Amino acid sequence: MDEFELIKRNTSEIISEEELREVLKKDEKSASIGFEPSGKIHLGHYLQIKKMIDLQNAGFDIIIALADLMAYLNQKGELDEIRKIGDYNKKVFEAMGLKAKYVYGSEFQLDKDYTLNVYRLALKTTLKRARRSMELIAREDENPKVAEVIYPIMQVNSIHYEGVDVAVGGMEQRKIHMLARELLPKKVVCIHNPVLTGLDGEGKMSSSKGNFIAVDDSPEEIRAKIKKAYCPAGVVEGNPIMEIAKYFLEYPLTIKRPEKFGGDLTVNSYEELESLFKNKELHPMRLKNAVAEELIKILEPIRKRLS
């Protein structure tokens, strides 16, 4: 599979494919993604880190922005407390097999010239565009604060200062990335990953929301949380267990069953798993079992390294 298609695999969109092809021709190119420090690193994070690894294997230099000041502007508590959580997150990412340069926002987002450019960009960005960009990012507030509208300008400015060719993030980042394309001299190529559904099945996977598989969860917690997960028979849309099968397991896949339920079963693609599950030829509990045991094996090297 070529570089382009490796990068495209399991993304929701690329802005634009044509521009990505131009970036691939360069001898040196770079990609970044930002993570607000999180107490738990979960499959949400891991999906995006896998995408960064795809880019790394395609010749990109990778920058992970440990986005302490962004999270501070997004109301995540005190800044020194936001910094302690990021130190752990770094170790987890290294344990996932990513080799990258790690930058804390605070190392450069308070420098004189960075700040002056925030204000320069603030003169060019409408309140309406700033607020629009934060709808899927800002926490649900009845009295929105000025911090909401500084945040997107700071993300845009960070992309400018990083000098990257590609910016990666979730689909929730879409409008901030579009602003960056309008506001900056160099149009950044944007790769968006899908939003993983949480295990409760009623929103995104989140650390604050308690509906996550952490990459360092122990095997019994992986089993318990998968067993309890939303997984309606025949239904693929909004089904977090099928999403995990899609984005994390490897095919062909051997799903172990007792012989009384049909015996062990081989599935050559996600699309085939989808077909079996839609037709109720595979029951929730048995998908869950397979997904739990596979995820335990996939996450083992990460648990081992973290120690």
What is the DSSP annotation of 20-37? HHHHHHSSSEEEEEEE--
Q: How far is CA 262 from the centre of its chain?
A: 36
Q: Output the six-digit token pair for 132.
A: 């629009």
Check residue 283 for interaction with Cl ion (CB under 5 A): yes
| Residue 243 host element (H or E) | helix 240-247
Check residue 116 for interaction with a second copy (CB under 8 A): yes
Q: Which of 174, 225, 286, 303 binds Cl ion (CB under 5 A)?
A: 286
Q: Which of 1, 5, 28, 123 binds a second copy (CB under 8 A)?
A: 123
Check residue 1 for interaction with a second copy (CB under 8 A): no
Please state the closest distance from residue 116 (CB atom) to a second copy, in A: 6
Q: Output the six-digit token pair for 224.
A: 């318990």
- 286 interacts with, out of Cl ion, a second copy, none, CB within 5 to 8 A per kind: Cl ion
Q: Output the six-digit token pair for 41.
A: 């690193």
Contacts of 99 (CB under 8 A, 6+ apart): 56, 62
- Among positions 236-275, residues that touch Cl ion (CB under 5 A) are none
- Asked if 75 contacts 168 with a C-beta cutoff of 8 angstroms, the reply is no
Among the listed ranges 135-143, 174-182, 207-215, 286-294, the one in contact with Cl ion (CB under 5 A) is 286-294
Report which residue type is found at 195: V
DSSP helix/strand/coil, 213: coil
Q: Which of 282, 291, 295, 302 binds Cl ion (CB under 5 A)?
A: 282
Preceding omega of 158 cis (within 30 degrees of 0): no
How many Å from the N-terminal Cα to the C-terminal Cα in the chain? 34
Among the listed ranges 67-75, 229-237, 265-273, 290-298, the one in contact with a second copy (CB under 8 A) is 67-75
Check residue 131 for interaction with Cl ion (CB under 5 A): no
- Among positions 151-170, residues that touch a second copy (CB under 8 A) are 153
Distance CA 140, CA 71 (A): 15
Residues that contact a second copy, how many (by CB under 8 A): 30
Please state the closest distance from residue 122 (CB atom) to a second copy, in A: 4
Crossing angle of the two packed helices 219-228 and 284-305, in degrees rounded to 10: 150
- 282 interacts with, out of a second copy, Cl ion, none, CB within 5 to 8 A per kind: Cl ion
Check residue 278 for interaction with Cl ion (CB under 5 A): no
Preceding omega of 252 cis (within 30 degrees of 0): yes
Please state the closest distance from residue 217 (CB atom) to Cl ion, in A: 25
Please state the closest distance from residue 280 (CB atom) to Cl ion, in A: 9
Q: Footprint of a second copy on this chain (CB under 8 A)?
A: 69, 72-73, 75, 79, 110-112, 115-116, 119, 121-128, 130-131, 143-150, 153
